[PDB]
């Protein structure tokens, strides 16, 4: 598994809501979640078509750039 930190903003990453869950599987472009910035808010969907494993972040929280944020398990066969 892979874990997704917060890409290049240019500033602070506040998040705003959360639309996935653990052992959830996303998709290569349903969102994931909303961050705001400090003159636009912009959203990060599913960069990997995996199931949630972990949360490393919450609702509400504040993160700086570069602080990792969830990490997706994109079960490549394994079997």
Known sequence: SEIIRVPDIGGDG????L???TGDL???EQGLVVLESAKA?????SPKAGVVKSVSVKL????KEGDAIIELEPAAGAR
Request: without cysteine; glycine residues 6%; proline residues 5%.
């Open 19 to 21: 639309l996935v869950k």
């Open 41 to 45: 808010s912009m959203e990060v969907p």
């Open 14 to 17: 506040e998040v705003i809501e």
């Open 60 to 63: 509400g929280d504040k993160l």
């Open 26 to 28: 996303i998709e290569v």
